[PDB]
């Protein structure tokens, strides 16, 4: 339960498979809903139970309410801490683009990674998690762009 | 049945590779949590 970034694994398919990634902060595990569909999670001998989730935001927290409340400043470069399946964690610096929506503007990062990278954290220069990677769209040219998906800290 | 495995600290890396562009895109979010291009 140490703070940090975690792979989300399952052994239901052939071998061991990385279905996503998440953030442990303040005793709570944060990932995207489509990684776990809200299932409970094993952490060693222990169990993590879902606490909050929302399919439309595509987010879920375990053991407690969503804790991550940093936001992109709209100006500065950020870093995807990508945790790809079978590969070491690596930081990728980028200047976010913008998802313009009817409900306001969302930061977005134009970085393409395997599906099981879903949930990897996006960081500001202070190392704070400004959102999670992996809910996005494919652009008119076939490239992938992810929202910077951030929850609300109750 | 799913399990988690620690993979690192959450830290900014001074020497990080820089890449990707900064597209400005009109999108819609539907009730299923899917983004779409307008």
């Amino acid at each position: 339960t140490t703070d940090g970034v975690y792979r989300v694994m399952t052994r239901r398919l052939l071998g061991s498979t990385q279905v996503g990634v998440g953030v442990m902060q303040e005793g709570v595990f944060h990932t995207m809903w489509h990684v776990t569909k809200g299932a409970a999670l094993r952490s060693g001998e222990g169990r993590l139970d879902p606490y909050w989730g929302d399919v439309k935001q595509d987010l879920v927290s375990y053991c407690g309410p969503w804790k991550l409340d940093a936001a992109w400043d709209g100006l500065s470069e950020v870093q995807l801490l990508a945790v790809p399946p079978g590969e070491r964690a690596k930081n990728i610096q980028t200047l976010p683009g913008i998802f313009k929506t009817k409900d306001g503007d969302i930061g977005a990062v134009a970085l393409d990674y395997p599906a099981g990278t879903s949930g990897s954290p996006i960081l500001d220069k202070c190392g704070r998690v400004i959102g999670l990677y992996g809910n996005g769209v494919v652009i008119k040219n076939g490239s992938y762009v992810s929202a910077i998906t951030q929850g609300k800290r109750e | 049945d799913m399990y988690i495995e620690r993979a690192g600290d959450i830290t900014w890396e001074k020497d990080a590779e820089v890449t990707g562009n900064s597209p400005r895109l009109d999108v819609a979010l539907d009730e299923s949590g899917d983004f779409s291009l307008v």
């Binding site: 995207m32 393409d112 599906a115 809910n135 996005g136 992810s146 | -």
Partner: peptide
């Protein structure tokens, strides 16, 4: 969309 095939 979630980009791996989507």
């Amino acid at each position: 969309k979630k980009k791996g095939x989507x």
